[PDB]
Design a binder for these strands. Structure first.
Lengths: 220, 48
DNA sequence: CTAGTTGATCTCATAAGGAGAAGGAGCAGAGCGCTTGAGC
């Protein structure tokens, strides 16, 4: 179990064509813990591999522990094709050439951004224009991924959906082989395989192994 | 009967009143009902 | 350019309404993806 390997698999699962090649392929830290049993180390590998500049971990808002992952190169290649042709395309390019390869912190302070990156107080709206700078608070702001709205809406919808059917299942159990074999519900479009990894990481289910494969149960 | 008239009714008109003070309907009959009395009272029972 | 002087200027110091419009609550039902689910 390697975090380099772990993140790669999730990346493959992503429905790339579903979002018209605009949102870079997000993979969650929750589903990272699914492939690698020892979470204790998964964070440690991704930590140095964060400052290694080959990954971007973006903080999301669907829960307190919402930390998404965006591929660095793909994060780069997609912002220009989204920013260019727009009024905000000006200093977002600077943000890219200066801020991204010099820092890896999840949220930038006011004095940090203005001084270290030499940002004015007028162009800062342009980064807020299309998913570049979120709003942590008055003094700090988390790093944004453009066009993240649609993803989480489907993501949250999907999580609820899978949770619901699992509960509905007779005797409140549902075999994992019975998810893949059965057609994915139309309510969730991110992929049934994508979400089942999420609850495993979120510990909403436990991977109980038996003679008939592995089973998931709500916590007792 | 009694029908609201004067300044109260004039105000009631200028500010559209959802609940008229004395709402009323002036019903006219078509056939024999208009001439004879039994059928007209029958229609009255049907409407009241 | 330099001191000395004169005012400004400040600071700190001791003690028997209403009609209507707007929001929200709660229930009530329609619809629909779903999950079975069992009769021919």
């Amino acid at each position: 179990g390697s975090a380099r390997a772990a993140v790669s698999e999730l990346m493959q699962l992503f429905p790339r064509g579903l979002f018209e090649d605009a949102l870079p392929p997000i993979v969650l830290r929750s589903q990272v813990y699914s492939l690698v049993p020892d979470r204790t180390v998964a964070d440690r590998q991704l930590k140095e591999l964060q400052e290694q500049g080959e990954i971007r971990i973006v903080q999301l808002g669907f829960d307190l522990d919402a930390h998404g992952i965006i591929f660095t190169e793909d994060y780069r290649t997609r912002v220009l094709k989204a920013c260019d042709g727009r009024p905000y395309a000006g200093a977002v390019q600077k943000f890219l050439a200066s801020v991204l390869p010099a820092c890896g912190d999840l949220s930038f302070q006011q004095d940090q951004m203005t001084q270290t990156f030499g940002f004015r107080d007028s162009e800062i709206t342009h980064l807020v224009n299309a998913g570049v700078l979120t709003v942590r608070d008055a003094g700090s702001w988390w790093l944004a991924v453009p066009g993240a709205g649609r993803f989480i809406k489907y993501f949250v919808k999907g999580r609820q959906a899978v949770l619901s059917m699992v509960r509905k299942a007779k005797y409140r159990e549902l075999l994992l082989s019975e998810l893949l074999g059965r057609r994915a519900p139309v309510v969730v479009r991110l992929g049934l395989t994508y979400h089942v990894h999420d609850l495993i990481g979120a510990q909403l289910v436990d991977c109980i192994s038996t003679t008939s494969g592995t089973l998931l149960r709500l916590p007792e | 009967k009694n029908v609201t008239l004067g300044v109260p009714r004039l105000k009631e008109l200028i500010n559209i009143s959802k609940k008229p003070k004395t709402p009323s309907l002036t019903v006219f009959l078509l056939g024999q009902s208009a001439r004879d009395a039994e059928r007209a009272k029958d229609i009255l029972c049907r409407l009241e």
